[PDB]
Amino acid sequence: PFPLPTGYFGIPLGLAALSLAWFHLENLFPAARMVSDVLGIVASAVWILFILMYAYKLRYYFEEVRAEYHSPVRFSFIALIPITTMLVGDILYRWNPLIAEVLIWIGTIGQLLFSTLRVSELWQGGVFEQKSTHPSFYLPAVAANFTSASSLALLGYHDLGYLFFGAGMIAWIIFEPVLLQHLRISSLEPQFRATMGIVLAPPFVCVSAYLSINHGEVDTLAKILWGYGFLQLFFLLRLFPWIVEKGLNIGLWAFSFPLASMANSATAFYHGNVLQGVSIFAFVFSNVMIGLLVLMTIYKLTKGQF
Amino acid sequence: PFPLPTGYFGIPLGLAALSLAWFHLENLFPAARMVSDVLGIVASAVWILFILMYAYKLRYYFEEVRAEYHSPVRFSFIALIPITTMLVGDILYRWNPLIAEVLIWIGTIGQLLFSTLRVSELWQGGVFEQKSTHPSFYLPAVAANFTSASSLALLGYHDLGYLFFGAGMIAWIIFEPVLLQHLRISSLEPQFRATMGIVLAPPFVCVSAYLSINHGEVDTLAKILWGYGFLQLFFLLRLFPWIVEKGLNIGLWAFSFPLASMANSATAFYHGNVLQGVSIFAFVFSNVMIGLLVLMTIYKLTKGQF
Amino acid sequence: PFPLPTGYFGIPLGLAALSLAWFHLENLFPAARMVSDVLGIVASAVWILFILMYAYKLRYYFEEVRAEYHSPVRFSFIALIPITTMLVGDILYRWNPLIAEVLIWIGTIGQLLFSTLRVSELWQGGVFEQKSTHPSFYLPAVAANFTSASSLALLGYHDLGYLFFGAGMIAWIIFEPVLLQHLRISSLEPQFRATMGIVLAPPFVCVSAYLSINHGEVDTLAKILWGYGFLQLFFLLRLFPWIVEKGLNIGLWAFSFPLASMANSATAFYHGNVLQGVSIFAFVFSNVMIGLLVLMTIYKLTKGQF
Numbered sequence: 040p041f042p043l044p045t046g047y048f049g050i051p052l053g054l055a056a057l058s059l060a061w062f063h064l065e066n067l068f069p070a071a072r073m074v075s076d077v078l079g080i081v082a083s084a085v086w087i088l089f090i091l092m093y094a095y096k097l098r099y100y101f102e103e104v105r106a107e108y109h110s111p112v113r114f115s116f117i118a119l120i121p122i123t124t125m126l127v128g129d130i131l132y133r134w135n136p137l138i139a140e141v142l143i144w145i146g147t148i149g150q151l152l153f154s155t156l157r158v159s160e161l162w163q164g165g166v167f168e169q170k171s172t173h174p175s176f177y178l179p180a181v182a183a184n185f186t187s188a189s190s191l192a193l194l195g196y197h198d199l200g201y202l203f204f205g206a207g208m209i210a211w212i213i214f215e216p217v218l219l220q221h222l223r224i225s226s227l228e229p230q231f232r233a234t235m236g237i238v239l240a241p242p243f244v245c246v247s248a249y250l251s252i253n254h255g256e257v258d259t260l261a262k263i264l265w266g267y268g269f270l271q272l273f274f275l276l277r278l279f280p281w282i283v284e285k286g287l288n289i290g291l292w293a294f295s296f297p298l299a300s301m302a303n304s305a306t307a308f309y310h311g312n313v314l315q316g317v318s319i320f321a322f323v324f325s326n327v328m329i330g331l332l333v334l335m336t337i338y339k340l341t342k343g344q345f
Numbered sequence: 346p347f348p349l350p351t352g353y354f355g356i357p358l359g360l361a362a363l364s365l366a367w368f369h370l371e372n373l374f375p376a377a378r379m380v381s382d383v384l385g386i387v388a389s390a391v392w393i394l395f396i397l398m399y400a401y402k403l404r405y406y407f408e409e410v411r412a413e414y415h416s417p418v419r420f421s422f423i424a425l426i427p428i429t430t431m432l433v434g435d436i437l438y439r440w441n442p443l444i445a446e447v448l449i450w451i452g453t454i455g456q457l458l459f460s461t462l463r464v465s466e467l468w469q470g471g472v473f474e475q476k477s478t479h480p481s482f483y484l485p486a487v488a489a490n491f492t493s494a495s496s497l498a499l500l501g502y503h504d505l506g507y508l509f510f511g512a513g514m515i516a517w518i519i520f521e522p523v524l525l526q527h528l529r530i531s532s533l534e535p536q537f538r539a540t541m542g543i544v545l546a547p548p549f550v551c552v553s554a555y556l557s558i559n560h561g562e563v564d565t566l567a568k569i570l571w572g573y574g575f576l577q578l579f580f581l582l583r584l585f586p587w588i589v590e591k592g593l594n595i596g597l598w599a600f601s602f603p604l605a606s607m608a609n610s611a612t613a614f615y616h617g618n619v620l621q622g623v624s625i626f627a628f629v630f631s632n633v634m635i636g637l638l639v640l641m642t643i644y645k646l647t648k649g650q651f
Numbered sequence: 652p653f654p655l656p657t658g659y660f661g662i663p664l665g666l667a668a669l670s671l672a673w674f675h676l677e678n679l680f681p682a683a684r685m686v687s688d689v690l691g692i693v694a695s696a697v698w699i700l701f702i703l704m705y706a707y708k709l710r711y712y713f714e715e716v717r718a719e720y721h722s723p724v725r726f727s728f729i730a731l732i733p734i735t736t737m738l739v740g741d742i743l744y745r746w747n748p749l750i751a752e753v754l755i756w757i758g759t760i761g762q763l764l765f766s767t768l769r770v771s772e773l774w775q776g777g778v779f780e781q782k783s784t785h786p787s788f789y790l791p792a793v794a795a796n797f798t799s800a801s802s803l804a805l806l807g808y809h810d811l812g813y814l815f816f817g818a819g820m821i822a823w824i825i826f827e828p829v830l831l832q833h834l835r836i837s838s839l840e841p842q843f844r845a846t847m848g849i850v851l852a853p854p855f856v857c858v859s860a861y862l863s864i865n866h867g868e869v870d871t872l873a874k875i876l877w878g879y880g881f882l883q884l885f886f887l888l889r890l891f892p893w894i895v896e897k898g899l900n901i902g903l904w905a906f907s908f909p910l911a912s913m914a915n916s917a918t919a920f921y922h923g924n925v926l927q928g929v930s931i932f933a934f935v936f937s938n939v940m941i942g943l944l945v946l947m948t949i950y951k952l953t954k955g956q957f
């Protein structure tokens with residue numbers, strides 16, 4: 040027996056997001072559907088396993104869950120559970136819209152209840168500290184709302200989706216200023232640096248969700264978001280040797296969700312005949328990086344360190 | 346004799362905003378006009394009284410006014426005076442556009458002069474402290490600009506209104522990051538917690554002003570603003586027992602202005618056939634809460650504690 | 652021999668921006684073209700000189716360049732070099748599009764490489780301090796991106812321009828919150844106060860770049876930006892006696908770039924028949940202020956203090 044570290048949900052999250060990116064190429068490149076289906080089935084399978092393992096954690100290691108929940112830093116990773124649940128729902132929609140819709144509502148109600156209970160509680164003061172100002176806060180505050188937005192749009196609830204989209208977008212712009220100031224002043228310790236990948240998530244998950252809700256119209260907002268997204272990509276690329284100062288490790292899966300979301304947005308830019316060359320590069324880049332994550336991960340489930 | 350506490354202007358402010366919300370239902374529900382007129386007359390009457398009392402304060406308790414003005418925290422409540430003056434102008438416009446226009450210009454010039462003199466002065470440093478980072482700052486910095494925007498639009502000056510709208514919207518997004526970080530780190534003392542209601546003001550006053558300037562077109566921006574607004578509403582609802590830890594008190598009128606503004610925006614969403622169910626719920630919720638404020642207040646003007 | 656202080660590039664920057672503002676009036680007021688050409692030639696000439704002087708600095712005072720580069724505050728002024736280079740390119744486009752395009756690409760690649768190397772490096776922590784939070788950070792982070800956006804648009808690359816525009820706009824909104832909080836708490840020392848002029852740059856350079864990329868369409872975003880821009884103008888006007896507490900000095904050229912950008916945006920508002928009266932006032936105001944800078948500067952190159 041062992042208690043599953045909640046951050047592991049980042050793995051099926053990244054693979055699910057990548058399935059959806061490929062799904063959106065099927066009409067341009069039919070073989071894309073098989074690639075999407077394979078990734079989607081693997082993501083769903085891993086999600087099922089991790090859900091069962093987390094159920095075990097709740098039953099037999101509840102005090103560990105309680106402690107992560109009340110931590111002003113570690114609580115954020117719990118949002119990965121409803122986020123991944125929604126993305127699995129989006130995947131499954133291609134086969135069974137009824138089950139997909141159940142998962143989407145469970146994830147949406149769950150994430151909203153989670154943030155209403157815990158994110159607001161921080162405003163009581165005295166628990167969260169300056170050192171609690173971590174990229175992971177984006178998970179409950181931003182990513183979860185964007186995921187609800189795009190999943191609700193998939194179900195045909197575009198205007199409700201806009202509400203969640205707005206919550207996520209404004210929450211992002213309201214937190215990032217203090218996060219980047221904190222990173223400038225305080226050197227984030229090596230053990231947390233892989234979570235710098237989450238800094239890439241807001242702009243690309245934002246544009247991906249936006250394009251899902253607005254019928255794929257590549258407009259001025261979408262281009263603005265891509266621009267800041269690439270800026271952050273370049274910054275993180277420059278920072279990569281510092282990020283992995285103490286070695287390559289499994290936390291690097293933090294980059295899969297934002298990169299897959301970048302790839303997803305690239306399919307819409309391509310369909311809209313906007314920056315097609317950039318779109319191709321972005322889509323290929325994301326896939327290569329996530330492929331490397333998969334390979335490094337196999338070259339290790341092997342050694343039994345996963 | 347006594348010096349009127351400047352925050353009391355929040356009362357006619359909330360009632361005035363609520364009059365305007367009902368005014369905007371008259372063509373859907375004719376009886377709404379009588380409700381609007383009654384609220385508008387009560388708001389105007391209370392405003393007249395409070396203005397006369399504040400004139401008395403300026404003449405006979407000037408050092409108290411001077412001290413509040415120079416305080417890096419308490420100065421903000423003075424903005425309630427021109428804000429309420431503008432809203433009374435919007436109300437009176439239905440009966441006498443000439444007087445309404447005088448009040449709107451007096452409030453607009455007044456708030457702009459006030460913020461130009463005092464908000465900028467803070468940037469000289471050394472007076473404002475980290476502990477000065479309070480929700481009340483939204484009054485001169487954000488709410489006053491949105492109110493000018495919507496009042497100018499009422500008078501037919503839409504493009505000038507957009508200038509004030511932009512000032513308020515960007516000022517909001519520029520202050521909120523540091524406010525929420527401060528609330529996370531430092532527990533706001535009980536005596537100030539009722540002013541957490543002002544945190545609800547920016548998104549709903551923003552969307553209300555926006556819809557006033559853009560002819561009621563419920564577009565993507567409006568939906569985005571509503572979404573963040575509801576997020577903040579849910580957060581504040583969860584936080585309510587903490588907000589009133591030391592008891593229910595008259596400061597809770599801080600919630601009336603934002604809730605009335607939410608109600609106003611809901612009339613436009615309803616007219617635009619966007620999220621009609623949400624609109625109805627929001628409009629009813631605001632009215633019930635403000636009704637409770639009125640009742641608690643009567644159950645007390647009685648006991649002589651007002 | 653002497654090492655040129657990098658901030659001096661603000662002079663040709665301001666004059667170049669002003670040339671472009673006048674250029675945009677030529678079809679309304681033909682004599683505007685001669686005024687534009689004169690300013691453009693002077694700006695270009697000064698830029699050539701300063702470039703040659705900075706080449707000398709790199710060859711013979713390299714350790715001074717190294718120290719400014721690694722400083723978490725002084726590095727920002729180096730961005731003036733590619734920024735001015737792009738604006739000279741925009742000027743020269745009227746005479747030789749081939750040379751103009753070379754300068755625009757050199758400035759764009761240069762600024763992007765500069766920010767990718769240095770702005771991201773700050774996120775490693777421990778070098779940048781709270782006291783490093785200065786208006787000058789806007790140069791590499793915001794102004795350089797907007798300048799690329801507008802210069803790329805000039806060359807016909809509107810969608811690539813939108814990427815740079817988005818990078819600059821979001822970078823602005825993400826830094827300003829912490830800058831204004833820092834100015835409120837810590838009094839900026841007199842020797843740095845002239846750089847308060849850079850606080851005026853983001854909103855006006857943003858709207859100028861925006862109108863360059865969107866074919867001059869004066870829309871809701873443009874009006875919103877102008878509104879916040881004027882708010883900041885009024886604030887800085889009120890603050891001016893404090894800014895020059897220790898005397899008038901050459902650092903006041905920090906105001907030329909934002910004021911010239913305001914003037915440029917005013918030509919587009921005027922062409923669009925939006926707020927024509929405001930546009931005229933803004934254009935005249937900027938020119939008078941920059942004229943005063945020129946006069947104060949002559950009344951001094953004289954005394955040999957430049």
Ligand SMILES: CCCCCCCCO[C@@H]1O[C@H](CO)[C@@H](O)[C@H](O)[C@H]1O
Nearest residue numbers: 097101104105106107108109117153
């Ligand atoms: C993902 C789920 C983790 C949920 C753990 C939540 C713990 C809820 O919080 C619990 O609330 C109680 C008040 O009812 C207290 O008595 C407990 O001390 C407290 O830990």
Ligand SMILES: CCCCCCCCO[C@@H]1O[C@H](CO)[C@@H](O)[C@H](O)[C@H]1O
Nearest residue numbers: 117118120121149150152153156160
């Ligand atoms: C993603 C799924 C969300 C699960 C969140 C469960 C949060 C439990 O929340 C708790 O519940 C108590 C009531 O017992 C609260 O009053 C406390 O604030 C809290 O500790």
Ligand SMILES: CCCCCCCCO[C@@H]1O[C@H](CO)[C@@H](O)[C@H](O)[C@H]1O
Nearest residue numbers: 258259260263821824870871872873
């Ligand atoms: C913090 C991020 C800033 C968001 C910038 C929003 C820019 C919205 O841009 C708008 O988009 C429309 C669609 O192409 C345009 O037609 C409008 O002309 C323009 O005002």
Ligand SMILES: CCCCCCCCO[C@@H]1O[C@H](CO)[C@@H](O)[C@H](O)[C@H]1O
Nearest residue numbers: 064302305306309318319321322323
């Ligand atoms: C992120 C979006 C990725 C889209 C992948 C498209 C790859 C196809 O690539 C392209 O195909 C075109 C016609 O199909 C060709 O004419 C182009 O030359 C070629 O670049």
Ligand SMILES: CCCCCCCCO[C@@H]1O[C@H](CO)[C@@H](O)[C@H](O)[C@H]1O
Nearest residue numbers: 266267269270316317320814815818
């Ligand atoms: C801060 C935002 C930076 C975004 C930079 C995008 C870089 C350009 O991207 C590239 O652009 C070329 C245009 O010169 C294309 O020909 C290529 O096909 C494309 O790969």
Ligand SMILES: CCCCCCCCO[C@@H]1O[C@H](CO)[C@@H](O)[C@H](O)[C@H]1O
Nearest residue numbers: 403407410411412413414415423459
């Ligand atoms: C709502 C109105 C309150 C206005 C009080 C403003 C006080 C103005 O400030 C006053 O300015 C003077 C400089 O002229 C000083 O001599 C006084 O010390 C100072 O208090």
Ligand SMILES: CCCCCCCCO[C@@H]1O[C@H](CO)[C@@H](O)[C@H](O)[C@H]1O
Nearest residue numbers: 423424426427455456458459462466
């Ligand atoms: C809402 C109405 C606005 C009233 C604001 C009055 C502000 C008075 O402002 C004062 O005036 C002095 C001149 O005597 C200033 O120079 C000072 O900065 C200030 O203390």
Ligand SMILES: CCCCCCCCO[C@@H]1O[C@H](CO)[C@@H](O)[C@H](O)[C@H]1O
Nearest residue numbers: 209212258259260261564565566569
């Ligand atoms: C900080 C808040 C962010 C503001 C987000 C602005 C989104 C503007 O959104 C825009 O709105 C228009 C009207 O429906 C659209 O048609 C455009 O297609 C889109 O770019």
Ligand SMILES: CCCCCCCCO[C@@H]1O[C@H](CO)[C@@H](O)[C@H](O)[C@H]1O
Nearest residue numbers: 370608611612615624625627628629
């Ligand atoms: C905030 C906006 C509040 C608007 C209140 C509308 C209340 C009317 O309620 C409605 O009236 C319709 C026709 O009038 C009915 O057909 C609907 O069933 C009913 O829900």
Ligand SMILES: CCCCCCCCO[C@@H]1O[C@H](CO)[C@@H](O)[C@H](O)[C@H]1O
Nearest residue numbers: 202203206572573575576622623626
């Ligand atoms: C973070 C933003 C959260 C906004 C959540 C809005 C909740 C839904 O709002 C409700 O939506 C239902 C749709 O299922 C409707 O049928 C109801 O009529 C409406 O009351």
Ligand SMILES: CCCCCCCCO[C@@H]1O[C@H](CO)[C@@H](O)[C@H](O)[C@H]1O
Nearest residue numbers: 709713716717718719720721729765
């Ligand atoms: C505008 C140009 C200024 C460039 C100065 C950049 C200095 C680059 O940084 C240098 O990098 C080296 C690592 O290669 C180190 O050995 C030096 O110590 C370091 O100063």
Ligand SMILES: CCCCCCCCO[C@@H]1O[C@H](CO)[C@@H](O)[C@H](O)[C@H]1O
Nearest residue numbers: 729730732733761762764765768772
């Ligand atoms: C505007 C023109 C940009 C010039 C920026 C040059 C930055 C040099 O950058 C340096 O280069 C090293 C490699 O030697 C880096 O690895 C270091 O991070 C850095 O010190």
Ligand SMILES: CCCCCCCCO[C@@H]1O[C@H](CO)[C@@H](O)[C@H](O)[C@H]1O
Nearest residue numbers: 515518564565566567870871872875
């Ligand atoms: C941080 C700055 C906030 C940006 C606000 C963006 C407002 C975009 O505003 C939009 O602009 C379009 C063009 O006029 C409109 O038609 C749309 O109706 C509206 O949603």
Ligand SMILES: CCCCCCCCO[C@@H]1O[C@H](CO)[C@@H](O)[C@H](O)[C@H]1O
Nearest residue numbers: 676914917918921930931933934935
């Ligand atoms: C920033 C934009 C400045 C534009 C300068 C325009 C100055 C012209 O000024 C104007 O010219 C019009 C016709 O040309 C006249 O009819 C107007 O009365 C007059 O105000």
Ligand SMILES: CCCCCCCCO[C@@H]1O[C@H](CO)[C@@H](O)[C@H](O)[C@H]1O
Nearest residue numbers: 508509512878879881882928929932
């Ligand atoms: C916070 C944003 C403040 C912007 C205020 C702009 C002030 C008005 O600007 C002026 O507006 C008049 C309208 O009364 C015009 O008649 C004038 O021609 C114009 O100069």
